[PDB]
Design a protein around this ligand. Sequence first.
Ligand SMILES: Nc1ncnc2c1ncn2[C@@H]1O[C@H](COP(=O)(O)OP(=O)(O)O)[C@@H](O)[C@H]1O
Ligand SMILES: Nc1ncnc2c1ncn2[C@@H]1O[C@H](COP(=O)(O)OP(=O)(O)O)[C@@H](O)[C@H]1O
Ligand SMILES: Nc1ncnc2c1ncn2[C@@H]1O[C@H](COP(=O)(O)OP(=O)(O)O)[C@@H](O)[C@H]1O
Ligand SMILES: CCc1cccc([C@](SCCN)(c2ccccc2)c2cccc(O)c2)c1
Ligand SMILES: CCc1cccc([C@](SCCN)(c2ccccc2)c2cccc(O)c2)c1
Ligand SMILES: CCc1cccc([C@](SCCN)(c2ccccc2)c2cccc(O)c2)c1
Ligand SMILES: [Cl-]
Ligand SMILES: [Cl-]
Ligand SMILES: [Cl-]
Ligand SMILES: [Cl-]
Ligand SMILES: [Cl-]
Ligand SMILES: [Cl-]
Ligand SMILES: [Cl-]
Ligand SMILES: [Cl-]
Ligand SMILES: [Cl-]
Ligand SMILES: [Cl-]
Ligand SMILES: [Cl-]
Ligand SMILES: [Cl-]
Ligand SMILES: [Cl-]
Ligand SMILES: [Cl-]
Ligand SMILES: [Cl-]
Ligand SMILES: [Mg+2]
Ligand SMILES: [Mg+2]
Ligand SMILES: [Mg+2]
Lengths: 336, 336, 336
Amino acid sequence: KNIQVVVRCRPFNLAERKASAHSIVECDPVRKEVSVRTGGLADKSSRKTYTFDMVFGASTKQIDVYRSVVCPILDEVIMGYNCTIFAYGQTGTGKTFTMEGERSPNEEYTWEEDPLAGIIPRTLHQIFEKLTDNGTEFSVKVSLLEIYNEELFDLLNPSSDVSERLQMFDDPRNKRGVIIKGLEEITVHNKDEVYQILEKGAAKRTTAATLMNAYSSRSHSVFSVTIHMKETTIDGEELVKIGKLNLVDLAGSENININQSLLTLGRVITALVERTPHVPYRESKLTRILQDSLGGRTRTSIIATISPASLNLEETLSTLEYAHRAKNILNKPEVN
Amino acid sequence: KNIQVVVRCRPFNLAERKASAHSIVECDPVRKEVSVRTGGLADKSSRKTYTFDMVFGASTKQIDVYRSVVCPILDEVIMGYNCTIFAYGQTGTGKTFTMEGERSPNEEYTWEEDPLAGIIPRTLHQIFEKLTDNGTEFSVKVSLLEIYNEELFDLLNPSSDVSERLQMFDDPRNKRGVIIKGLEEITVHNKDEVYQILEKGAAKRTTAATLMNAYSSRSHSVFSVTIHMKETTIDGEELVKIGKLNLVDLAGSENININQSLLTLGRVITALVERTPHVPYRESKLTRILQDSLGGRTRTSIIATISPASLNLEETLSTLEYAHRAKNILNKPEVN
Amino acid sequence: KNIQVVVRCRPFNLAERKASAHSIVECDPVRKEVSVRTGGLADKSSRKTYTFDMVFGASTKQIDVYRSVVCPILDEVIMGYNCTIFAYGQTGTGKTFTMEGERSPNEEYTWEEDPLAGIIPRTLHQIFEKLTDNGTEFSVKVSLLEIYNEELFDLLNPSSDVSERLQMFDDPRNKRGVIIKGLEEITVHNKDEVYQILEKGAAKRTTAATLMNAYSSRSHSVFSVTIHMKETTIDGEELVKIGKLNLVDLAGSENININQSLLTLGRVITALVERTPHVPYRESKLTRILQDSLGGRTRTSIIATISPASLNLEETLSTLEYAHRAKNILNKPEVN
Ligand SMILES: Nc1ncnc2c1ncn2[C@@H]1O[C@H](COP(=O)(O)OP(=O)(O)O)[C@@H](O)[C@H]1O
Ligand SMILES: Nc1ncnc2c1ncn2[C@@H]1O[C@H](COP(=O)(O)OP(=O)(O)O)[C@@H](O)[C@H]1O
Ligand SMILES: Nc1ncnc2c1ncn2[C@@H]1O[C@H](COP(=O)(O)OP(=O)(O)O)[C@@H](O)[C@H]1O
Ligand SMILES: CCc1cccc([C@](SCCN)(c2ccccc2)c2cccc(O)c2)c1
Ligand SMILES: CCc1cccc([C@](SCCN)(c2ccccc2)c2cccc(O)c2)c1
Ligand SMILES: CCc1cccc([C@](SCCN)(c2ccccc2)c2cccc(O)c2)c1
Ligand SMILES: [Cl-]
Ligand SMILES: [Cl-]
Ligand SMILES: [Cl-]
Ligand SMILES: [Cl-]
Ligand SMILES: [Cl-]
Ligand SMILES: [Cl-]
Ligand SMILES: [Cl-]
Ligand SMILES: [Cl-]
Ligand SMILES: [Cl-]
Ligand SMILES: [Cl-]
Ligand SMILES: [Cl-]
Ligand SMILES: [Cl-]
Ligand SMILES: [Cl-]
Ligand SMILES: [Cl-]
Ligand SMILES: [Cl-]
Ligand SMILES: [Mg+2]
Ligand SMILES: [Mg+2]
Ligand SMILES: [Mg+2]
């Protein structure tokens, strides 16, 4: 019902250690609380403390995130629901690391086994174990678009030029959802197809980053997975159940047509929590795509990412405030 | 009468080819049409198509531009009219290349013969052939100023510091024109003087680019040529006919006191085409200089430059829209 | 009474000489006038001329600045007054050079003898000569904070992370002054302590410059010196006299929450000279700190710094105009 909101804090990086950054963040997994030290040299006892559905401190690893947050959501996708997980937070804090992950250098690890892999690869792997281990007939289609400056780009298209644009339209079968005209949806026949698909997507992103200013922090990225499963009743009737999972990595929250989406996202959340009558979904590409995940029939989680350094105090607080409000968004989840 | 407007599209560059840029532009010289592919991955048949006075595709060369556009204008300068050609378009699309040209590397070519030379050098050469081949007594004076951030700089001054500023005043002999106080006008005695004059101007520009932020894309450049010719009537009377040619290379059109001129240019064109009563010439240095070329006694052409890449779709459309409106500007041309 | 305002013009630098910068500034020490050549190529005789309390031309040296401006102020600090000197001017013109100075390269000079040393080191040295040469018991405490984006940072704190923030509060003993909660005030026992203190402060600044965007030009720097002296009356009574000296190096004047202080400074000066009723001290960190120096019981001087190059004409004029107004600020100076 309420959307689930969790917080992940990344460890210090080398720049921060070189600069002797002190920590101002404290995670308590059991009480599910984050607590920010607030008063610098002036007031040593000051704190702001917030309660979330779950809390992940600096030493938390990609496997822990997946086990705690995604497994439950993945089961519900398998039972024929739509789900959305998204990452919100300041640039540099681990939205991408959490949602995609990285490759460990050289040969080192098989992609199914890279400890650095994030939610998207781990999920694609699990869909194959859980549904093959299980008998049952199924197909998996993925897609990956990016929104930048209110234009949409298709990272998995066979087209060789990233800058060729998609277009968006209302679904006549779902008052709350959209059709992306031109989107490539690639059918993923087994887990041995996965990596090449992602690698071509990554190569497409690299080109786009060289074409557009500050691409990697000003853009939103939407990875979707659609699964079709065959169910036979006890009467012997053959009916299909469809589950869809969107994995969204938002533009950096510090950025306030170039910020349109990140700004309409904020107004949308506000209009929902403060129960205002017209909710401005239409006003950005992002919120049209996410409309059903903010107040609709989709089950939603948010991963708020934060830095632990004293330097980013203000933005850290800002992310926590923003994400804590979002707990009061109520969805009405429903199978397809 | 109507001002003449033409379009030049440059070929792909190496960055674009490295990025597998697709083309979205199509020039048809005979029907005089440019046609932009408009719907990316979503709608393959979509186009916007526009008709101009002339159209130059990617494979068009500097010699072709000169033959088609300038010769006719040069004849009319020789017959004692004022003319203005200017380049309008997004940064990176060939305003400078078209108006000045480049030098081919090493020894390679004599400047009169460099295939890379643009309109200004080619014109200065022709003035000397056409008027020496012709008997007739004549003098040629040139000048070159730049407007940046509403300050005027004189690239041909003997002064060693580029940053010394010119000032502007109304001409008491021409309700539509200006005197530039302090401008150096250099007398060009033969074509063997030309290149050194341009080379010193280029060296002055190089310094200015290091002094002022983004100088080369935020500045307007005005090259003028003034020719005095001696005519004897059939009665034996000696009267002088003066022709003047301005060659303007505007700041890049993507830039929206720093954009004052490019912004007042837009309002001026608007006030003329939509027949509004007070036309705000006074409000920028550029439009004061160009006042007689926008709605006055000067004969004007505009060269709109565009990229062919899918990436620049929006600006490409924007340039074509802007330039197509300008066809409805009516001038009343007249000898001096 | 009136605040004292003086002008320092720096010599050309290598970039300017490489670019053949002409000069547009003329200092006349005896008549106390600066005079800016104003009309570029257009009008050679044009000038704007301004009178200040003192005037220092390009060839003036750090020792001259100190002798003329600081000695008098230092005597008055010793007699138990509060004084403030601050530097105002465009980035690149010598606020830091004037207020701190530089180190001559390699071994070269003892810090007490470096010809490049500015007002802060020279002053700390003199406090020790003048008060030891003199018998009399005394202690000296220094402090150094920086304001950036309305946050306060403490460069002399033992804390290893610069980004830990101070907080500000009204002094209940002085309607016109503030307490900085958390500020480290280091006791300086002899002149052999000085340099290490400054060197640690400089190392703290270096880190901050790497943490925050454009730190060195957008930040204000406040160095304070507090001196306690023991006086015995002729009756044999033991009373303490306190003198305080603030040495402020403002953010660059070309920058118009990031400009809040530099903007409220301007409004404050305006409200004083134009005698407006509510003076908006409260509205920035800087003006709260400086409140007593703008219209209060502190004795104030301003050092306006300017470039001599033709290129910076506009900002040069702007600094002179701004500083000339400030001569009409009246203070009511008083011992503690
Ligand atoms: N949880 C984490 N553990 C270790 N390193 C991390 C973590 N999160 C982020 N990083 C590192 O910080 C950098 C920024 O992460 P990134 O995902 O790009 O953040 P964002 O996309 O939010 O800007 C990357 O180099 C990443 O390795
Ligand atoms: N018509 C053309 N043919 C070949 N190269 C061109 C052409 N127009 C522009 N270029 C190249 O593109 C770059 C940008 O041209 P430039 O004239 O500087 O554009 P602008 O002044 O409009 O920014 C230059 O390197 C130039 O060689
Ligand atoms: N009076 C001066 N004499 C010689 N060099 C100077 C003088 N003032 C400034 N400079 C040089 O100019 C540069 C800028 O000085 P700086 O104090 O950093 O100016 P600001 O802090 O006003 O930006 C420094 O390299 C400094 O050496
Ligand atoms: C860009 C699509 C995507 C999504 C999720 C994970 C990956 C990557 S890391 C994404 C770049 N931030 C990937 C990296 C390099 C080449 C191919 C694939 C991926 C896949 C599997 C495991 C892993 O650790 C990383 C890529
Ligand atoms: C800057 C004045 C100007 C005008 C038109 C053409 C040129 C140049 S190229 C302008 C730089 N974008 C020129 C280039 C380098 C040195 C001297 C002259 C020029 C002159 C003749 C032929 C030619 O190909 C180029 C220069
Ligand atoms: C940053 C505090 C401070 C104040 C005034 C003067 C100095 C320096 S130069 C300040 C940097 N712009 C200083 C430079 C490097 C290392 C230690 C001290 C200083 C102290 C004494 C003499 C001198 O020439 C310079 C430092
Ligand atoms: Cl690291
Ligand atoms: Cl922690
Ligand atoms: Cl793992
Ligand atoms: Cl629609
Ligand atoms: Cl808002
Ligand atoms: Cl090329
Ligand atoms: Cl073509
Ligand atoms: Cl040729
Ligand atoms: Cl005038
Ligand atoms: Cl407008
Ligand atoms: Cl120098
Ligand atoms: Cl001088
Ligand atoms: Cl000295
Ligand atoms: Cl207070
Ligand atoms: Cl104001
Ligand atoms: Mg990212
Ligand atoms: Mg150019
Ligand atoms: Mg400085």
